[PDB]
Design a protein around this ligand. Structure first.
Ligand code: SF4
Lengths: 303, 51, 49
């Protein structure tokens, strides 16, 4: 009886929420042929209660998510037909506009669905920090990804310029003190360079011991801060070969940072008002903007 | 050609290409789009093959 | 005005929106009536060419 076969397959799926394989189905019901089992599986997939997964072990048939219900008012059809892509998004989340365009349902209907799911605690709405336009909905069980929301720098969808500046200043002061100690040691050039070199893990532990903010700062966060300092033109990083040590971050490679003085002092162009003039393009001998009656050079000479 | 592209290398390591659950929505199709699907050649061919 | 207008009205008899299903606007029969002038205060009156 195909109805009995489908019922037994549904019972096996209930017993194994993670899915069942054709081998398990055959072991449970060996007196039925593979053709009948395949016909039953096809009917189940056509009526829409089972889902197919392709794992390294083969094929898995899992019961569709129906027991987990957050919107029972109305019909579970739209509930699951929204929870599908809600789960598909998961960590990356999805905006309400995208949910509406993917569901092809009215704004009021989708809002009611989302409100019922949030009231029954199946989805959480978090403000997208990348683009603060709408609130993305994610699964209540999944951990919020750092790229789409959160972050050690962002606090309530607000960048902490003061925090990053304090981090940069503290790191630069530490590196400068380390380089000064290395230069004062004057034991040997190589030893001085190795001592001026500062490891990412070392500076991270130093920042942790300082404890400027309450949010935990990661080694990659400190590495990004040091990269920003490098881009600022104040420190230099070198990649040395070390199999394993106290860092163990990168496979075989270790990044060492050291505060370095600039290449050359400020040039001569910047010392003249002409080089720092914003309307320099409109300069002319005879006209409104003339060097004879200039205000920039006048004030620069008066100072 | 697909088999050649796959065997481009002598020994093909076990690919971790597990089929993520890409179950798309059975979105409610508008009347115009449903009529277009019904009038499409693929639908008629499938209906003829069903027999 | 006697047949073509009715055929156009029949072709465009039903109009509905995608949002909020079960809502529609159905046209039944269109009339042109006799020539009138909207001069009077919400009152019609036969007017000559
Ligand atoms: S206003 Fe004077 S200082 Fe400024 S660009 Fe012109 S000449 Fe140079």
């Amino acid at each position: 009886d195909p109805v009995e076969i489908e019922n037994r397959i549904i019972e096996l799926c209930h017993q194994f929420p993670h899915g069942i394989t054709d081998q398990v189905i055959q072991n449970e019901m060996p007196h039925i042929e593979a053709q009948q089992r395949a016909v039953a599986i096809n009917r189940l997939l056509s009526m829409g209660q089972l889902d197919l997964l392709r794992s390294n072990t083969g094929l898995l048939y899992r019961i569709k998510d129906s027991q987990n219900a957050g919107k029972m008012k109305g019909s579970d059809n739209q509930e699951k037909l929204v929870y599908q892509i809600i789960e598909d998004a998961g960590n990356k989340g999805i905006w309400s506009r995208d949910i509406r365009y993917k569901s092809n349902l009215p704004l009021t209907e989708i809002n009611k669905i989302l409100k019922n799911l949030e009231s029954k605690k199946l989805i959480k709405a978090v403000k997208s920090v990348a683009a603060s336009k709408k609130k993305v909905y994610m699964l209540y069980n999944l951990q919020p990804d750092r790229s789409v929301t959160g972050g050690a720098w962002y606090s309530d969808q607000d960048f902490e310029s003061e925090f990053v500046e304090v981090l940069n200043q503290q790191c630069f002061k530490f590196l400068q003190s380390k380089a000064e100690t290395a230069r004062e040691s004057k034991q040997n050039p190589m030893i001085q360079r190795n001592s001026s070199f500062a490891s990412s893990h070392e500076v991270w532990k130093y920042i942790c011991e300082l404890g400027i903010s309450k949010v935990e700062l990661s080694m990659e966060d400190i590495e990004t801060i040091l990269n920003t300092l490098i881009y600022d033109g104040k420190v230099e990083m070198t990649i040395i070969a070390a199999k394993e040590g106290t860092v163990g971050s990168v496979d075989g490679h270790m990044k060492l940072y050291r505060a370095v003085n600039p290449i050359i002092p400020p040039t001569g162009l910047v010392r003249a008002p002409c080089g720092l003039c914003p309307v320099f393009d409109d300069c002319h001998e005879g006209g409104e903007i003339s060097p004879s009656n200039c205000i920039y050079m006048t004030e620069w000479l008066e100072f | 050609e697909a088999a050649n592209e796959a065997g481009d290398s002598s020994q093909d390591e076990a690919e971790d290409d597990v089929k993520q659950i890409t179950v798309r929505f059975s979105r409610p199709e508008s009347e115009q789009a449903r009529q277009r699907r019904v009038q499409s050649y693929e639908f008629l061919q499938k209906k003829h093959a069903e027999e | 005005i006697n047949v073509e207008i009715k055929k156009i009205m029949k072709a465009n008899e039903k109009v509905t929106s995608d949002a909020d299903p079960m809502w529609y606007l159905k046209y039944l029969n269109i009339y042109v009536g006799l020539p009138d002038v909207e001069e009077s205060f919400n009152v019609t009156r036969p007017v000559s060419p």
